[PDB]
Amino acid sequence: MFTINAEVRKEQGKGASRRLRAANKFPAIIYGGKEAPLAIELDHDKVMNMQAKAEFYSEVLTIVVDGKEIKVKAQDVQRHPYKPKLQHIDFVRA
């Protein structure tokens, strides 16, 4: 029941990822199955309110990006140590 509006990452690496946190974005990745992994960027203000509910980690979510809808599940979420922020979220196809 969850719709995540996202875009495909043009740039990559440490220098690229820190520029996204200045613009209220954060890096991510959708992997699993026979398909190759793809680096995706998510908006912080929209996503940060969702994982407060317990249904985010249990129920299946649908990441909308360029008219795809991969339909993935949450695996591992890296948080920023000394603030309430998100660093990187792993996704698995299902």
Partner 1 sequence: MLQPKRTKFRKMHKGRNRGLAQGTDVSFGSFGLKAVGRGRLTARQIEAARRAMTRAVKRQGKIWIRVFPDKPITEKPLAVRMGKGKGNVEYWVALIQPGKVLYEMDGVPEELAREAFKLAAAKLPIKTTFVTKTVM
Residue ranges in contact with partner 1 by CB under 8 A: 57, 74, 76-82
Nearer to partner 1, 9 or 90 (CB): 90
How remote is the C-alpha of 40 from its chain's centroid?
7
**Cα separation values, 68 from 5, 55, 63, 64, 72, Å:** 11, 23, 8, 6, 12
Residue 37 CA to residue 41 CA, distance in Å, equals 13
* Binder of residue 77, out of RNA, partner 1, none (CB less than 5 to 8 A by kind): partner 1
* Minimum distance of RNA from residue 92's CB (angstroms): 29
83 binds RNA (CB under 7 A): yes
Which CB sits closer to RNA, 22 or 54?
22
Please, which residues bridge with residue 41 across strands? 7, 27
Location of structure tokens 């890096």? 27
Among 14, 69, 84, 94, binds RNA (CB under 7 A): 84
Contacts to RNA by CB under 7 A? 83-84
